[PDB]
Amino acid sequence: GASIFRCRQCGQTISRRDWLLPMGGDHEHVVFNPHGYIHRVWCFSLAQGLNLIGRPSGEFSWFKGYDWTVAQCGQCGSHLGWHYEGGSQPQTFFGLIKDRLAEGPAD
Ligand SMILES: O=C1CC[C@H](NC(=O)c2ccccc2C(=O)O)C(=O)N1
Ligand SMILES: [Zn+2]
């Protein structure tokens, strides 16, 4: 039972442990926004249940080569992280904020 990652606010299924993706040799990145707020971000190859908000941006990306878009939970609107695109190996992935996910057993 790969564990399941749900939205912490509502419980919607978002991703799974077996979809964790090492970027830079690690699937966990401790990063901060340009205001100096820390986020602990886990990278996933795939995710479901998310809505993308806005257009992609290249500014301030944590991951070289990728442009990003805000990702919210499609059920409750919680800001769960970001979708990345435009790169290679992989072309796209998700960076999700660990503390906004709740990891647990399958249904
Ligand atoms: O790779 C990326 C994804 C997006 C991310 N930006 C933010 O985290 C951001 C920017 C301005 C204000 C707040 C935030 C935030 O979501 O915490 C950033 O700095 N890098
Ligand atoms: Zn939610």
TrEMBL record:
Binding, Zn(2+): C7, C10, C73, C76
Taxonomy, superkingdom: Bacteria
CULT domain location: 2-105
GO molecular function annotation: metal ion binding
Residue numbers binding Ca(2+): D26, E28
UniProt keyword annotations, A-Z: Calcium, Metal-binding, Zinc
Protein name: Cereblon isoform 4
